[PDB]
Amino acid sequence: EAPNQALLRILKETEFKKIKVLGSGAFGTVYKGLWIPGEKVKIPVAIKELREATSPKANKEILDEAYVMASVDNPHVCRLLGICLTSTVQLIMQLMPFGSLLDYVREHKDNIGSQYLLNWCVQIAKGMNYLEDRRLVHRDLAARNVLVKTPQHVKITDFGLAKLEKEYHAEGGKVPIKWMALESILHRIYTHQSDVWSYGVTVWELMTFGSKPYDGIPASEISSILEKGERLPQPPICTIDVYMIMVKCWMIDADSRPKFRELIIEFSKMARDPQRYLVIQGDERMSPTDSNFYRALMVVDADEYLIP
Amino acid sequence: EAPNQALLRILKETEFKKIKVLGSGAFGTVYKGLWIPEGEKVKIPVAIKELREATSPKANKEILDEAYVMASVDNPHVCRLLGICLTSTVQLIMQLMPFGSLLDYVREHKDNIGSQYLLNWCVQIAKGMNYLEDRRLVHRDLAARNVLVKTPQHVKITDFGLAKLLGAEEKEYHAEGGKVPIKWMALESILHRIYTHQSDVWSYGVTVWELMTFGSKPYDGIPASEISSILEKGERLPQPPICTIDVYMIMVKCWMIDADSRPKFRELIIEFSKMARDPQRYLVIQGDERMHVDADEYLIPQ
Ligand SMILES: Cn1c2ccccc2c2c3c(c4c5ccccc5n(CCC#N)c4c21)CNC3=O
Ligand SMILES: [Cl-]
Ligand SMILES: [Cl-]
Numbered sequence A: 001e002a003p004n005q006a007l008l009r010i011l012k013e014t015e016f017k018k019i020k021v022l023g024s025g026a027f028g029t030v031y032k033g034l035w036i037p038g039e040k041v042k043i044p045v046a047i048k049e050l051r052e053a054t055s056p057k058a059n060k061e062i063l064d065e066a067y068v069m070a071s072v073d074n075p076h077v078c079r080l081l082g083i084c085l086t087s088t089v090q091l092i093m094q095l096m097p098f099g100s101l102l103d104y105v106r107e108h109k110d111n112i113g114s115q116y117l118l119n120w121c122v123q124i125a126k127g128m129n130y131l132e133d134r135r136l137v138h139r140d141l142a143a144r145n146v147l148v149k150t151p152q153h154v155k156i157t158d159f160g161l162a163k164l165e166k167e168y169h170a171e172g173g174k175v176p177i178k179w180m181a182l183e184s185i186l187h188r189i190y191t192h193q194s195d196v197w198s199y200g201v202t203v204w205e206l207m208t209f210g211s212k213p214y215d216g217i218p219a220s221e222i223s224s225i226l227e228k229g230e231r232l233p234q235p236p237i238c239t240i241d242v243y244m245i246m247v248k249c250w251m252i253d254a255d256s257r258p259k260f261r262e263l264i265i266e267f268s269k270m271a272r273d274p275q276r277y278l279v280i281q282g283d284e285r286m287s288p289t290d291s292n293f294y295r296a297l298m299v300v301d302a303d304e305y306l307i308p
Numbered sequence B: 001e002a003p004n005q006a007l008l009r010i011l012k013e014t015e016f017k018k019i020k021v022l023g024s025g026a027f028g029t030v031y032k033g034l035w036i037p038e039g040e041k042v043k044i045p046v047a048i049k050e051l052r053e054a055t056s057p058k059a060n061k062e063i064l065d066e067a068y069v070m071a072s073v074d075n076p077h078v079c080r081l082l083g084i085c086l087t088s089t090v091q092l093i094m095q096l097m098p099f100g101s102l103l104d105y106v107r108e109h110k111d112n113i114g115s116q117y118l119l120n121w122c123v124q125i126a127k128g129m130n131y132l133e134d135r136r137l138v139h140r141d142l143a144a145r146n147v148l149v150k151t152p153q154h155v156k157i158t159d160f161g162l163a164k165l166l167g168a169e170e171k172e173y174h175a176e177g178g179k180v181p182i183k184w185m186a187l188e189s190i191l192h193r194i195y196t197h198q199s200d201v202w203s204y205g206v207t208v209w210e211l212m213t214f215g216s217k218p219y220d221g222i223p224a225s226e227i228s229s230i231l232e233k234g235e236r237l238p239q240p241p242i243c244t245i246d247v248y249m250i251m252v253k254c255w256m257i258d259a260d261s262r263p264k265f266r267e268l269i270i271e272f273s274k275m276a277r278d279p280q281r282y283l284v285i286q287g288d289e290r291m292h293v294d295a296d297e298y299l300i301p302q
Helices: A056-071 A101-107 A114-133 A182-187 A192-207 A219-227 A240-249 A260-272 A292-297 A302-306 B057-072 B102-112 B115-134 B187-192 B197-212 B224-233 B245-254 B265-277
Strands: A016-024 A029-035 A043-049 A080-084 A090-094 A146-150 A153-156 B016-024 B028-035 B044-051 B081-085 B091-095 B147-149 B155-157
Touching: A016 A043, A043 A302, A056 A080, A056 A090, A101 A146, A101 A192, A101 A292, A114 A153, A114 A192, A114 A260, A182 A192, A182 A219, A192 A240, A192 A260, A240 A260, A240 B057, B016 B044, B057 B081, B057 B091, B102 B147, B102 B197, B115 B155, B115 B197, B115 B265, B187 B197, B187 B224, B197 B245, B197 B265, B245 B265
Parallel strands: none
Antiparallel strands: A016 A029, A029 A043, A043 A090, A080 A090, A146 A153, B016 B028, B028 B044, B044 B091, B081 B091, B147 B155
């Protein structure tokens, strides 16, 4: 092949501070974080820290993870800012100052634009197919995990990636029942076509402007309702053609579900004529702005600093 | 062009129960069923089609394609689906025509069929067809068995399983093999697996035949393989005794070898509608003068 000249940066624990715990696992936990660096600018980040300081196998995994993430390089997949070799290893993953898409969309639903909505689907499909070109399974696609660099540019977190042979099992605790494919629910296994299922759901959240999927429904019921053939309802904005794309992602059979390269083609094709495929009231006139998540930090994007 | 806001509704199978089987196919089965919408307090009669297996993506893709068309078309003589069921084997839920296939209907009631109805049915079939020509969709399996009778007054088209949608770029669609029965298909479709709206007209001509003869089998004696020869030989379906030369002529044009020569559906509505003004003249039937908790498709619409 070719040399992987990916830079790995080692940051001191003093350099970064962890605001709050976003998620927890049997091994390791993930914190919302602020990184400073002696520079004026502050950078929002996600930090993954091993729960346990002394497990050879866990340490081997966390280093491979840091190897893949640093190895990853795509406009729509979060860059790995660096790692810090405490006894408990931590990995720093860039976060965008404006925040996540899900929150962003709820804040701006009134002013939201149809072209932007089709454009985000093409972008997420690009990151996922990039990820899938290497044999890499995201295991958690959702609108909270899609980050807004700018309203035109979004990126998806690559934390906790699993690399393939056909399928990989994953146990962490705090699992997201609603976004997972039924196959994943019953047997706790994740494939690319399972990730597509989560992709379908993500698009739904975008289309409804951030309504909660299967809202007010217990997680135990969800596995059964999927067997009965219930699925998410049509987004009022959505055309039948767009909805069909979501429906195919929610097909019980894995192979029936669309492959990611397909999804990129389709959405870019619909992106050429967005107004025919998505109908939003007062669609023609609607503006880029700061976000509520971004307000709390009040920040600098990581990508701009690193450029020099 | 315009956005398609036709809406497809997902329904959990617990919402509907199946009282009885209307018909069997190798693809799968159609059930008579009562559908209760959750929350809503009405009972809707419905027909549910269910495939034999969810095993194959192609099977999966075609049903999803079929369901997409049946939801997107809205015509008074095109049967519409109420919703879909994402179960492992996908389920199709459609408005129920209680009476059944027209072909079934004609044989049982041959003694009572007035000339107007036969003309009135012909008009209605064409009207639905003509809509599908507008929608760029070729039905690809028209027969009196695929024409259902919600009521004698009203009839709707059915079984879009074979139907394919033409590309704007391409005037005609060609598909490998022939799933469909030979007798209905136009000669170009048998020889070259070519299908066009004009090829649908040919099948239309066979559907009218079936009505005018009260459902007798086309080329009833003949095995399917021979049929391609006889058409080339020039034999065709014989004059329905009830039929005048003016009406039968119309069926002749449909089974013309040259597809562009045969009538367009638009024409067929006007030609059969004009006959429908003065039916006795254009159709001769003995005793013709003598011859004449709730849910519905209507209910769903405002
Ligand atoms: C065979 N059959 C009937 C027989 C007696 C009474 C009704 C039907 C019927 C109906 C439908 C269908 C229908 C809808 C889509 C596809 C096929 C349908 N069939 C039979 C075709 C097969 N298989 C239907 C059908 C759809 N609504 C029906 O009533
Ligand atoms: Cl999370
Ligand atoms: Cl959940």
